[PDB]
Amino acid sequence: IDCGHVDSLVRPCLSYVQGGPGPSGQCCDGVKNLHNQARSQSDRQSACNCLKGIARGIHNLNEDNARSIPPKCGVNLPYTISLNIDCSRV
Numbered sequence: 335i336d337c338g339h340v341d342s343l344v345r346p347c348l349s350y351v352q353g354g355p356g357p358s359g360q361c362c363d364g365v366k367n368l369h370n371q372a373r374s375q376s377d378r379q380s381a382c383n384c385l386k387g388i389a390r391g392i393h394n395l396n397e398d399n400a401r402s403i404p405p406k407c408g409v410n411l412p413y414t415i416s417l418n419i420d421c422s423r424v
């Protein structure tokens with residue numbers, strides 16, 4: 335998606351990405367939605383840029399904690415996250 339509904343849906347996740355319990359079920363719905371939105375090639379580019387703008391901007395943040403989000407609610411992503419991994423320009 336054009337770096338927008340993703341931006342909205344990550345917010346409930348940010349609590350945990352930054353440092354917290356959960357995240358909430360809303361984020362889990364957000365997770366399957368991110369996986370579903372991030373599928374066309376454009377989408378990977380837009381989501382990746384959204385990320386390189388948002389969380390990279392919020393440097394005080396814990397990507398490796400976020401790693402645990404998918405193996406918890408029960409879902410996976412085409413790639414994890416471009417803070418300590420890569421933009422995944424598929």
Ligand SMILES: CCCCC[C@@H](O)/C=C/C1=C(C/C=C\CCCC(=O)O)C(=O)CC1
Nearest residue numbers: 344347365372381384385388389403411412
């Ligand atoms: C696990 C999915 C829920 C979000 C938690 C965490 O991974 C945060 C990701 C953020 C993103 C998206 C980052 C990468 C996209 C991965 C999914 C994909 O593109 O297939 C932003 O734009 C800012 C924060």
